[PDB]
Amino acid sequence: EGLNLVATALAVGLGAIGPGVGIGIIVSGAVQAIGRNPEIENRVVTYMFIGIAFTEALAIFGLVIAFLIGF
Amino acid sequence: EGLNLVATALAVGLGAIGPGVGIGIIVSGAVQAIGRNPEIENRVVTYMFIGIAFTEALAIFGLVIAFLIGF
Amino acid sequence: EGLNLVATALAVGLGAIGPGVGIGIIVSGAVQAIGRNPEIENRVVTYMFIGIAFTEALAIFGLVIAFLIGF
Amino acid sequence: EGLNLVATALAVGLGAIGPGVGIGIIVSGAVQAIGRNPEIENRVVTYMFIGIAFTEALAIFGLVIAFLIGF
Amino acid sequence: EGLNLVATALAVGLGAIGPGVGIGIIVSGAVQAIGRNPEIENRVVTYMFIGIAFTEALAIFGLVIAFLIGF
Amino acid sequence: EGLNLVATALAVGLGAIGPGVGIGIIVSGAVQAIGRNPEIENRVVTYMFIGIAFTEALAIFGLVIAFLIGF
Amino acid sequence: EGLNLVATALAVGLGAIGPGVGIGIIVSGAVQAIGRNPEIENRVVTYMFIGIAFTEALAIFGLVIAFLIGF
Amino acid sequence: EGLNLVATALAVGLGAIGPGVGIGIIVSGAVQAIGRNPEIENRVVTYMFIGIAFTEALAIFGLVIAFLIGF
Amino acid sequence: EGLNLVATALAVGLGAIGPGVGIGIIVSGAVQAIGRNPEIENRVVTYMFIGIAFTEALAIFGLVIAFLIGF
Amino acid sequence: EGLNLVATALAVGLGAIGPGVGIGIIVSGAVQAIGRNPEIENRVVTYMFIGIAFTEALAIFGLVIAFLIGF
Amino acid sequence: FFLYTGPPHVEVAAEVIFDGIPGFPITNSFVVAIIIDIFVIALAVAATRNLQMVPRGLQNVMEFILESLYNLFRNINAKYVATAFPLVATIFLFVLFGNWFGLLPGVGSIGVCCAAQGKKLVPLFRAPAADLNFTFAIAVISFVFIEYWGFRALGPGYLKKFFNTNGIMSFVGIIEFISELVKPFALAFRLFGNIFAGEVLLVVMAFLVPLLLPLPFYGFEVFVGFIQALIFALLTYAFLNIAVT
Amino acid sequence: HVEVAAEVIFDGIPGFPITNSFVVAIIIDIFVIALAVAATRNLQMVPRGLQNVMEFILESLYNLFRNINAKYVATAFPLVATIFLFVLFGNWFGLLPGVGSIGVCAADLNFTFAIAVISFVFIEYWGFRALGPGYLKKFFNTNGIMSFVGIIEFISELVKPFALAFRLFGNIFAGEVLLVVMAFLVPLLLPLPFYGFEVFVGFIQALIFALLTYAFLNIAVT
Amino acid sequence: NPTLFIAQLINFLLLIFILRALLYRPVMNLLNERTRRIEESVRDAEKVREQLANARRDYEAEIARARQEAAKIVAQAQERAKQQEAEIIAQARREAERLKEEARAQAEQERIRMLSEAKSQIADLVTLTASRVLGAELQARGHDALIAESLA
Amino acid sequence: PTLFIAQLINFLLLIFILRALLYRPVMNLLNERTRRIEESVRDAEKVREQLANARRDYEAEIARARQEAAKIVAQAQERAKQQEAEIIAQARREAERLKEEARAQAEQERIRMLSEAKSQIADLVTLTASRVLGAELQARGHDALIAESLAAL
Amino acid sequence: TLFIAQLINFLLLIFILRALLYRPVMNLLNERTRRIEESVRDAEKVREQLANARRDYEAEIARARQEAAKIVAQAQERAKQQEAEIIAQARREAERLKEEARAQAEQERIRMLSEAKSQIADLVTLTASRVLGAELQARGHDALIAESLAAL
Amino acid sequence: NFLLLIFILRALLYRPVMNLLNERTRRIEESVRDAEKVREQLANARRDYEAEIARARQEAAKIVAQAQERAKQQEAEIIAQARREAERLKEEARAQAEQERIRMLSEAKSQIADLVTLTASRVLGAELQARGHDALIAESLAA
Numbered sequence A, B, C, D, E, F, G, H, I, J: 001e002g003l004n005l006v007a008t009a010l011a012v013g014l015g016a017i018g019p020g021v022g023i024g025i026i027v028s029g030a031v032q033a034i035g036r037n038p039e040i041e042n043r044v045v046t047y048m049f050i051g052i053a054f055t056e057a058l059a060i061f062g063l064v065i066a067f068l069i070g071f
Numbered sequence K: 001f002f003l004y005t006g007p008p009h010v011e012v013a014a015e016v017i018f019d020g021i022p023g024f025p026i027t028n029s030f031v032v033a034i035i036i037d038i039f040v041i042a043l044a045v046a047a048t049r050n051l052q053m054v055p056r057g058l059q060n061v062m063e064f065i066l067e068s069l070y071n072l073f074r075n076i077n078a079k080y081v082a083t084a085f086p087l088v089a090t091i092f093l094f095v096l097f098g099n100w101f102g103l104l105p106g107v108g109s110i111g112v113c114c115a116a117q118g119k120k121l122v123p124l125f126r127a128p129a130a131d132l133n134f135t136f137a138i139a140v141i142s143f144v145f146i147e148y149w150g151f152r153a154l155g156p157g158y159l160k161k162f163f164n165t166n167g168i169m170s171f172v173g174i175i176e177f178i179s180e181l182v183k184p185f186a187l188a189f190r191l192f193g194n195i196f197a198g199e200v201l202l203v204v205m206a207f208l209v210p211l212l213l214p215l216p217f218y219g220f221e222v223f224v225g226f227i228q229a230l231i232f233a234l235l236t237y238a239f240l241n242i243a244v245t
Numbered sequence L: 001h002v003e004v005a006a007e008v009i010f011d012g013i014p015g016f017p018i019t020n021s022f023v024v025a026i027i028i029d030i031f032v033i034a035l036a037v038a039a040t041r042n043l044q045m046v047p048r049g050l051q052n053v054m055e056f057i058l059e060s061l062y063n064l065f066r067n068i069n070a071k072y073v074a075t076a077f078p079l080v081a082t083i084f085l086f087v088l089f090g091n092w093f094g095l096l097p098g099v100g101s102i103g104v105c106a107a108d109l110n111f112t113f114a115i116a117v118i119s120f121v122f123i124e125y126w127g128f129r130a131l132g133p134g135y136l137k138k139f140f141n142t143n144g145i146m147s148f149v150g151i152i153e154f155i156s157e158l159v160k161p162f163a164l165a166f167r168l169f170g171n172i173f174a175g176e177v178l179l180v181v182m183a184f185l186v187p188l189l190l191p192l193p194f195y196g197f198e199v200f201v202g203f204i205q206a207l208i209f210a211l212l213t214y215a216f217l218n219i220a221v222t
Numbered sequence M: 001n002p003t004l005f006i007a008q009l010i011n012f013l014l015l016i017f018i019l020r021a022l023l024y025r026p027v028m029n030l031l032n033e034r035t036r037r038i039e040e041s042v043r044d045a046e047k048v049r050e051q052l053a054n055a056r057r058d059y060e061a062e063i064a065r066a067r068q069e070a071a072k073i074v075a076q077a078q079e080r081a082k083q084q085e086a087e088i089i090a091q092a093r094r095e096a097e098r099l100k101e102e103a104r105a106q107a108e109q110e111r112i113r114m115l116s117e118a119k120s121q122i123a124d125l126v127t128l129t130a131s132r133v134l135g136a137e138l139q140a141r142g143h144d145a146l147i148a149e150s151l152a
Numbered sequence N: 001p002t003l004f005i006a007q008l009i010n011f012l013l014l015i016f017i018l019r020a021l022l023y024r025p026v027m028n029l030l031n032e033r034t035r036r037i038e039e040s041v042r043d044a045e046k047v048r049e050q051l052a053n054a055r056r057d058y059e060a061e062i063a064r065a066r067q068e069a070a071k072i073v074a075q076a077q078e079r080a081k082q083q084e085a086e087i088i089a090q091a092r093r094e095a096e097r098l099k100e101e102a103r104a105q106a107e108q109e110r111i112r113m114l115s116e117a118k119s120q121i122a123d124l125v126t127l128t129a130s131r132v133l134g135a136e137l138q139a140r141g142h143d144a145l146i147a148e149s150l151a152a153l
Numbered sequence O: 001t002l003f004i005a006q007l008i009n010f011l012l013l014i015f016i017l018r019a020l021l022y023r024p025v026m027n028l029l030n031e032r033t034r035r036i037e038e039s040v041r042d043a044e045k046v047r048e049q050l051a052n053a054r055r056d057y058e059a060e061i062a063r064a065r066q067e068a069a070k071i072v073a074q075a076q077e078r079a080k081q082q083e084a085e086i087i088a089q090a091r092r093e094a095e096r097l098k099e100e101a102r103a104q105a106e107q108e109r110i111r112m113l114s115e116a117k118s119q120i121a122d123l124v125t126l127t128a129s130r131v132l133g134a135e136l137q138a139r140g141h142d143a144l145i146a147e148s149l150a151a152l
Numbered sequence P: 001n002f003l004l005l006i007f008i009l010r011a012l013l014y015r016p017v018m019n020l021l022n023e024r025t026r027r028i029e030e031s032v033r034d035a036e037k038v039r040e041q042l043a044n045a046r047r048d049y050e051a052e053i054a055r056a057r058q059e060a061a062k063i064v065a066q067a068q069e070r071a072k073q074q075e076a077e078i079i080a081q082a083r084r085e086a087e088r089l090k091e092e093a094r095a096q097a098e099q100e101r102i103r104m105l106s107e108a109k110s111q112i113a114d115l116v117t118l119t120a121s122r123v124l125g126a127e128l129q130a131r132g133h134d135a136l137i138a139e140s141l142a143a
Helices: A003-015 A019-036 A044-070 B003-013 B017-036 B041-070 C003-036 C041-070 D003-036 D038-068 E003-036 E042-070 F003-036 F041-069 G003-036 G044-070 H003-015 H017-036 H042-070 I003-036 I041-070 J002-013 J017-036 J038-070 K028-048 K059-076 K085-091 K094-099 K132-162 K175-207 K214-244 L020-041 L052-068 L077-083 L088-094 L109-125 L144-169 L173-184 L194-221 M002-106 M108-114 M117-133 M143-151 N002-021 N023-131 N134-139 N142-152 O002-139 P006-106 P108-122 P133-139
Strands: none
Touching: A003 A044, A003 B003, A003 B041, A003 J002, A019 A044, A019 B017, A019 B041, A019 J017, A044 B041, A044 J002, A044 J017, A044 J038, A044 L144, B003 B041, B003 C003, B003 C041, B017 B041, B017 C003, B017 C041, B041 C041, B041 L052, B041 L144, B041 L194, C003 C041, C003 D003, C003 D038, C003 E003, C041 D038, C041 L173, C041 L194, D003 D038, D003 E003, D003 E042, D038 E042, E003 E042, E003 F003, E003 F041, E042 F041, E042 K175, F003 F041, F003 G003, F003 G044, F003 H017, F041 G044, F041 K059, F041 K175, F041 K214, G003 G044, G003 H003, G003 H017, G003 H042, G044 H042, G044 K175, G044 K214, H003 H017, H003 H042, H003 I003, H003 I041, H017 H042, H017 I003, H017 I041, H042 I041, I003 I041, I003 J002, I003 J017, I003 J038, I041 J038, J002 J038, J017 J038, J038 L144, K028 K059, K028 K094, K028 K132, K028 M002, K059 K085, K059 K214, K059 M002, K059 N023, K085 K094, K085 K132, K085 K214, K085 M002, K094 K175, K094 K214, K094 M002, K132 K175, K132 K214, K132 M002, K175 K214, K175 N002, K214 N002, L020 L088, L020 L109, L020 P006, L052 L077, L052 L194, L052 O002, L052 P006, L077 L194, L077 P006, L088 L173, L088 L194, L109 L144, L109 L194, L144 L194, L173 L194, L194 O002, M002 M108, M002 N023, M108 N023, M117 M143, M117 N023, M143 N023, M143 N134, N002 N023, N134 N142, O002 P006, O002 P108, O002 P133, P006 P108, P108 P133
């Protein structure tokens, strides 16, 4: 049946089910830190961008798995 | 049978936790930061838009699989 | 097999779970920010409205699949 | 194939889950804000009611899905 | 098969999932606010009971859905 | 065909999951309030009794669902 | 087949996760409470018991459901 | 059809999630408590270690059922 | 039926979900403690390693469960 | 076939979001600590690297199951 | 440290009845209720004795317990705290009386004629805690008392709590009223589930090597029973305060 | 009565006889040209509407970019300007402009893909323009244990243009679906301003696309 | 079931009322009696301190009243004594005036003894003039008359 | 059945644990409550006894003050009588002194009057000697007296 | 569909409603901004006019300084005239001194005449004494004795 | 196809680019002109005050110098007058001495007339038998 479609759908939905949430939490914490130390910025923001890339790596892997399922 | 529709619905419903959660977390952090400094809120609003995009990026990643299931 | 209604209900519930928590988190953060001071109520209300708009957009994206199951 | 009953059940439970948590979070935030200064109640309670109504909008969508399960 | 029993069971579990947690979160926030200022007392208690009723609304909706599944 | 047992197990697990987090949050908030002062700790624990009671009621409804599944 | 066993395992895992989260939350609050309120030991143990019992009671209900599934 | 293997999977993955999350928050709370002050040191470390056993109690419990699944 | 591989993957992912989150929470608490308070980084690192071992216990338990599923 | 794709889906979706979420939490905590004390940023990044390594170890351990499912 | 033998089997039930139905329907649940009532009456009579302000004597222990309950009620409220003090005391230590003999030795086998015949060897202990009829009855009595007290405070105010909660804008009334109505049922389910679940855990530890695992679980259950008694008493006073509020 | 449909097409393919997305793009370009003509024919230093909108848009965007990252704000001011008056401009044409291609017997993800490719080129034209090795710096170095995540970050940045393209396709096809759902059930527009909220979200999304371009620029800055 | 539930409810209510009226009412009475005894003890201690202070003040006031009465009596006696002493001094002054008058009356004995000129003084002066100063030749007719004239 | 035996063993173990767990602490708490009650009762009894003794001592102090006041008043009356007698005696003494002074001054004035009478008699004798002997010399023998006086030189 | 057509019409109606709601707000915001830009331009124009006025005021201040210098020169000339007048008064005072000297010389001449008269008188007295001695020696001095008894 | 209006609107964008810069450069020109005006006004006031003070000082110095010169000349004239006065006094004294000697020489005979007058009344008499008072006066004629 539609087992491949169901699998790809569930994989995408569950993979994208909080990595973004963690990214938003990191963003909020970075916003709090920037409000705390506006002078100390753009390096904490750099680490924030690095962490954003690290979090988005999971979504990229999930999307790649879904595409491979589609292939 | 309905496994195609079931897959599309599962993909659509799932993942919404991560996006909404990240948005709410970033929204609360942005509220705190805007309370801290409306002048630095410029850079803060910029980062908030970046996080909003990242969460919307994950949501669009899910909606892409949803639309692919639609076809 | 009735899988259409099951899929629609699952999608609606899973989507509402995400937004139903993200909007609440955004509102709670706005409440805390207001409790800090009622000074940025214009800007704070604008940011809260932006967050509510993002959450409602996610909710509507989810609810669209509910009617699509009817289609 | 009594999948419609399971559909309504899961939809109601999932809708009450996310919206219930968001409502509780908004309530705790409003409690903290009132503990700070309840003198701003005219705006704070109104915003809390609006946030609950958005959560209540999601809950009403879930209840409407439960009712349409009769269809 | 046991589709009705599974339906009622899943409804009860999923409804109690987010409602109880949200109610506990609201109660914890109320506890923090009351420890911050017992002066509010009934005044804070009023919003506390309001949030308790708001969460119990979803809780009772889930319980009633389960009871209707039982019939 | 074991679907009743599956129902009871799933309901018990989901219900125990949902209320445990809320109870622990209420306990942590009570700990914070106790750290604030032991003076209103009488009234604080009194309010905490209602918070424990609400989550206990949710868990009791969940366990009662399993008991009814027992017969 | 092993549907009853799978149900028992799922119930155990689900109950354990939520009760484990609640116990950990209560423990974290107690750890912060220790700093918030000096540990005279006069009421520290009493506070600890309240938090531990909440999760333990829910966990024993889950484990008893699992044992009954064993029967 | 691998139902017993499926049975072995459910408890193993699910239970430790709350235990791993709860312990770390308790540990981070203890770390925050130790970061506040390590005057209690071993005394707090042991109270922190006390919560560790309570969390691992459910974690050990799940592995026990695995042997029951394994035999 | 191939259900063994699905069971192993699901159990591994479910076990890993709690472990990574708990480890990140512990790391965040340790970082906040060390930044707030230096010169305790020795006992702080000891506690961080202890918590890492506590989470890795469940992680390795899940990994061993998956390996035994492979056997 | 279907179980295969299902196994890949379970490997992909489960655990991935939670790992990045804990990573983002650790990142936000490190950002807040660095804003509090930029002087200890060396040891802060050293701990942050270890935390990111642990999170990536969890994520790669999860992805290994999917890769083996690829065969 | 082994307990290799002795693990015969596992058996459970929802509620247990007894003989004596002829004059009127008599159940083992009512039997345990009467036993607990007799024990409580004996304790009260013994604590009465002289009562000439004499410290200790184990009557002062019950006096200190009652004083702690009275202080808790006074901190909770004052409008009818003394008026409902005996009413609260009705719940107080009666649920603990149910927790009493909860870990009684052989209480489960009390009623074994005895796994040989088992035709009428139903376990005739049936704690009042293991009787939702007792729990539902106590909860209904508490709800009736709370409603009567609220009506005495303001019957029109009691109506305006739900029906006229907010004629303008939105009213949590009716929905709140439904929550209050469930709260009696919720409290009944809390007590009905309490002890009953404990008894199941006691059987389960007995089902699988009862070697001091039943001791720790039983101690936790006894503490939980005391907590549940205090919880029901506190919920009664909380509903009373809410009606007063 | 829903009759919506997808638009999976190819920009490498020739212009379609229908080309509804290309038609909407042409309409948006014509509207932009007409607005420029109306704002230049009756043009003043501070004209109301004619020059007020231009001042409040271009200068505000330039100030936001300057506050975002200097030394490239003017160097890529026109890039965000191209991102400006785009997506949101088409979104407004697509914001239920009375037709919705009714009675036919910008929205192109390929156009979104083209904009994503343009951004990635800007992420490579200006990207490492001042660095050269900076894109490959701290990648598989003696610090390779931590630099391994650098290659993953580079792949994530590569997907980020695709993410922006999808997000552009997001809420556009989703917006049309929402309009059709409002047409399929609950007729006579909607008491909740769903179309208006969609238009506002689309304008915010175009602004967010420009912000994402500037953010990729600032990421490539160091 | 429902009949059993109602029977359990009736038994619980009866036991509740019985236990209340037996112990709780006696327990409430005993606790209230203890609290009232403590409050009355505090009030009585305050009243005892007040009574001691009032007793000290009353002793001081009685001493003051005794001193005032004694001073009044002493002042009255002193005034009476002063009046009596003034009367005695006035009587002494009157007696001194009477003595001075008696001395003035006795001063008339100067003129009374002055009536001895011709008795003694005339003869003495005549003899002195005849014998001592002048010689025995005393031819003095009317010189005796001149002496008599000078005597007056 | 054997379940009864297992439950009995578990109950015995639980009772053994409990009787040494905090039975000593529970008895300590009960004895502390009893000791507090006993201390409060003893304090109340001592306060009542002190109040009774304080009322008695207040009455005694009032009586003692009244008695000392009566003694002071009796002393005042006796001293007033004594001082009145002393004033009368002092007045009598000063009056006797004044009367004796009057009598002494009268005798002194009598002696002065006698001396003044003698002096006035001498003055009268000198005046008579002036008035007399004018005849005996001037009337006749003035030349004879002059001749005799010249013979004396 | 007629209902679909009504919905399409009301879509435009809601658009117009939202416009009446905020289009005016946006117009007000634009007027505020454009006004801030116009204020900056007015500031620039006022600054240029201020520069021109500052140059004109520099010319006016140089003229005022030149006028003050001319007034100072006029005052210096007046002071020189006053000094010349004082010197003439000093010359008049010198003329007063010249007249005082002439008076002193006339007084000296009169005093010299008086002194010469006194000297001539003394010489005349001496020569008269000599001539009188000679003439009296020639005359003889017989009758001088008779003159000695005019009053004695 | 999307880049159709990209460079097309860029010319319109470049068209508003100068005007915003013109509005921006207006502020810079505003500040420069205001600062120049303030500086020019301050310098003008300082220069006017300095010129007035210098002119006053120069006039005062010239007046003082002229007064000193005039005072010196007047004092010189007065002193010169004094020498002439002294010379006139000396000439008058010499002339008075000469006139006194001449008057004495001329009136010696009249003194001798008054001489015989005083001589006659010298003794209020003159024995006829005498050389003669006039003859004796001739003998004592002297001067």
